[PDB]
Amino acid sequence: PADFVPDSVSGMFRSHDFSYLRLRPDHASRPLWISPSDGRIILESFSPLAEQAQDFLVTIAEPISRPSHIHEYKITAYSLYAAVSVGLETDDIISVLDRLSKVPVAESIINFIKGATISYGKVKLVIKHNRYFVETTQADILQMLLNDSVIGVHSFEIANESVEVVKKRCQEIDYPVLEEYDFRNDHRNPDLDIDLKPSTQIRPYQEKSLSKMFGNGRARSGIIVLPCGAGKTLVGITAACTIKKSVIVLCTSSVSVMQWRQQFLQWCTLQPENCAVFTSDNKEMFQTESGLVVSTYSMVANTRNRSHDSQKVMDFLTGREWGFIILDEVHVVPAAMFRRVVSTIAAHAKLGLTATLVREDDKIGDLNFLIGPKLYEANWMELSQKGHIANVQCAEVWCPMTAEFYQEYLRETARKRMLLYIMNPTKFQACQFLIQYHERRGDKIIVFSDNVYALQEYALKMGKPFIYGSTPQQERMNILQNFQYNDQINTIFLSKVGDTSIDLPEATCLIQISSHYGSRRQEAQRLGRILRAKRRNDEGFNAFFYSLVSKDTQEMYYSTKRQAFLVDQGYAFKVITHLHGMENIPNLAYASPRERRELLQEVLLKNHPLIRKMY
Amino acid sequence: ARARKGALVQCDPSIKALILQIDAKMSDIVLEELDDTHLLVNPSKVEFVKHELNRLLSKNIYNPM
Ligand SMILES: Nc1ncnc2c1ncn2[C@@H]1O[C@H](COP(=O)(O)OP(=O)(O)O)[C@@H](O)[C@H]1O
Ligand code: BEF
Ligand SMILES: [Mg+2]
Structure with missing residues (x-):
């Protein structure tokens, strides 16, 4: 910014006027705009070299939003740490950035890349016989690590529990640690001979994801983010198949444990002998040299009360030095005690698999040092247009509450306010009319409702099956099987239980009467259920995703906040x-005033052997 | 036949509750009730109530930041 006359409209831009720089004549070809201060990147998706820089930019810059035409990216310290890992230096980044940037890379941006691109590659953490050694390739690091107030060719031991502390210390200090596993030269750990059968097919986007993880030839530790239904299960299977070592899978559900094992058996060639499932039903552990354990975070994260049956398994897990760990739905690993499994379980490589990499609290960024940086992220829209995932016509239906109910809405306290507007009569009519309309069309409908009481009320009146936490595994499976293979039943009423890692290929329509406040991942994960549509390639097919929201209620504030992640991905609501033809429907719930008042009162009222013969 | 100065407010049933609730705490707001979707209010309070209603309605609308 030297000798540049401000414009009369420069006042409207509060220090954001970046016109001080000039533009080269080759602006017609260069597809990248760079903000000299904020680090933001604006990418043209309708210009030559768009595909040329679509992969280069993703590696260096994380995506804030990728709508139809103009893609938006931002460069951050964490994003650079991921990029520098895969054989990238400042010189290469600077040379390519200038070759592609319409506006010159400012000194501030140049300074930012220099600082964070030079630290990588001077400290490594290795594991030997369940003993963790902070090995360094140069002796100069000893004067920096051993003298650290937190800690405690040269190699020194470090406590397993202290790993969660030193890794954060590594981020704070200049040198961050990298977890690279040389499986090729690792012979001490017994190998597991498994390869994908010929029937298997590797999709290009998955192939790109695997390449980002096996770029240098040594297994990396990080996170792979793919849209729901992209096939993350096969990505984990391929990673397990190529490493050919002891592996384990952790999932935060019971039904999903069978799903992962079922996919594992069919896709790869692992024999049933080497696979053991550690759940509440069965706890036997494989005695063969090497195998797989598909367990849940609850079983491995428990510390206080472990019984004899589970205690033996825990000793077996801890005693042996494993090679790989798979964390399905890794967006819940940095929790208070779910993160303990990463440290307690010894493994030379860690993989994270979550469709959504966001959460309400600011602990999402902690995944960098719990499991590693972000390796690859796949755009939802690109896969949708390629026929790999279904298209969804997201809609938000406004249901104005009736006057009688709204009268109590103002007075009622917030705690009971939720229950008040969740069972408003207008939403019943919309849900019933939409369900009937889609049932006539021949659509498999899934109804989600976080409130158990509302879920029961909907099902009891509508005479449709409902599933919620109290139901057993056998009953819910029977209901699920009936909903899939039987033409008589085409709609089900699910709850928060099936919000994640559930495969419903036949589901095409989704309705959400009321849900979990401001949570965003719930909105996206629930949307992923209908992204599984088997008939996602037939012409004119469009999955339906509805979100009934009461007008003039806090649900609008929650609804607009929870769907803030889908808009970033690209989906538009x-x-x-008003629903056309809704009045001509023969019958509707609570049509007469008498029935409406009956509902209002009910919801308002809610809150010695000898002696034995005598008797 | 008395010309009672007031603003002829036409509103939906949802908004009607707000004006009634607003009148509950501040009695002077609503002069009289006309019908379910119609109301008569103090002409002076019209400027204040409209801004007051927006603040209450502003809460249920999310703001990105
Ligand atoms: N390459 C593939 N070949 C065959 N089916 C695939 C492939 N990739 C994904 N699928 C299918 O996509 C669906 C979802 O797979 P899954 O791994 O459970 O997805 P995610 O875990 O990402 O939600 C399943 O029907 C699975 O068989
Ligand atoms: F992301 Be998937 F639906 F497990
Ligand atoms: Mg999955």
């Missing part, structure tokens, strides 16, 4: 003020 349509407002439906």
Whole structure:
């Protein structure tokens, strides 16, 4: 910024006027705009070299939003740490950035890349016989690590529990640690001979994801983010198949444990002998040299009360030095005690698999040192147009509450306010009319409702099956099987239980009467259920995703906040003020005033052997 | 036949509750009730109530930041 006359409209831009720089004549070809201060990147998706830089930019810059035409990216310290890992130096980044940037890379941006791109590659953490050694390739690091107030060719031991502390210390200090596993030269750990059968097929986007993880030839530790239904299960299977070592899978559900094992058996060639499932039902552990354990975070994260049956398994897990760990739905690993499994379980490589990499609290960034940086992220829109995932016509239906109910809405306290507007009569009519309309079309409908009481009320009146936490595994499976293979039943009423890692290929339509406040991942994960549509390639097919919201209620504040992640991905929500043909439906719930008042009162009222013969 | 100065407010049933609730705490707001979707209010309070209603309605609308 030297000798540049401000414009009369420069006042409107509060220090954001970046016109001080000039533009080269080759602006017609260069597809990258760079903000000299904020680090933001604006990418043209309708210009030559778009595909040329679509992969280079993703590696260096994380995506904040990738709508149809103009893609938005931002460069951050964490993003650079991921990029520098895969054989990238400042010189290469600077040379390519200038070759592609319409506007010159400012000194501030140049300074930012220099600082964070030079630290990588001077400290490594290795594991030997369940003993963790902070090995360094140069002796100069001893004067920096051993003298650290937190800690405690040269190699020194470090406590397993202290790993969660030193890794954060590594981020704070200049040198961050990298977890690279040389499986090729690792012979001490017994190998597991498994390869994908010929029937298997590797999709290009998955192939790119695997390449980002096996770029240098040594297994990396990080996170792979793919849209729901992209096939993350096969990505984990391929990673397990190529490493050919002891592996384990952790999932935060019981039904999903069978799903992962079922996919594992069919895709790869692992024999049933080497696979053991550690759940509440069975706890036997494989005695063969090497195998797989598909367990849940609850079983491995428990510390206080472990019984004899589970205690023996825990000793077996801890005693042996494993090679790989798979964390399905890794967006819940940095929790208070779910993160303990990473440290307690010894493994030379860690993989994270979550469709959504966001959470309400600011602990999402902690995944960098719990499991590693972000390796690859796949755009939802690109896969959708390629026929790999289904298209969804997201809609938001506005249901104005009736006057009688709204009268109690103002007075009622917030705690009971939720229950008040969740069972408003208008939403019943919309849900019933939409369900009937889609049932006539021949659509498999899934109804989600976080509130158990509302879920029961909907099902009891509508005479449709409902599933919630109290139901057993056998009953829910029977309901699920009936909903899939039987033509008689085409709609089910699910709850928060099936919000994640559930495969419903036949599901095409989804309705959400009321859900979990401001949570965003719930909105996206639930949307992933209908992204599984088997008939996602037939012409004119469009999955339906509805979110009934009461007008003039806090649900609008929650609804607009929870769907803030889908808009970033690219999905757009349509407002439906009125449903055509809804009045001509023969019967509707609570049509007469008498029935409406009956509902209002009920919801308002909610809150010695000898002696034995005598008797 | 008395010309009672007031603003002829036409509103939906949802908004009607707000004006009634607003009148509950501040009695002077609503002069009289006309019908379910119609109301008569103090002409002076019209400027204040409209801004007051927006603040209450502003809460249920999310703001990105
Ligand atoms: N390459 C592939 N070949 C065959 N089916 C695939 C492939 N990739 C994904 N699928 C299918 O996609 C669906 C979802 O797979 P899954 O791994 O459970 O997805 P995610 O875990 O990402 O939600 C399943 O029906 C699975 O068989
Ligand atoms: F992301 Be998937 F639906 F497990
Ligand atoms: Mg999955």
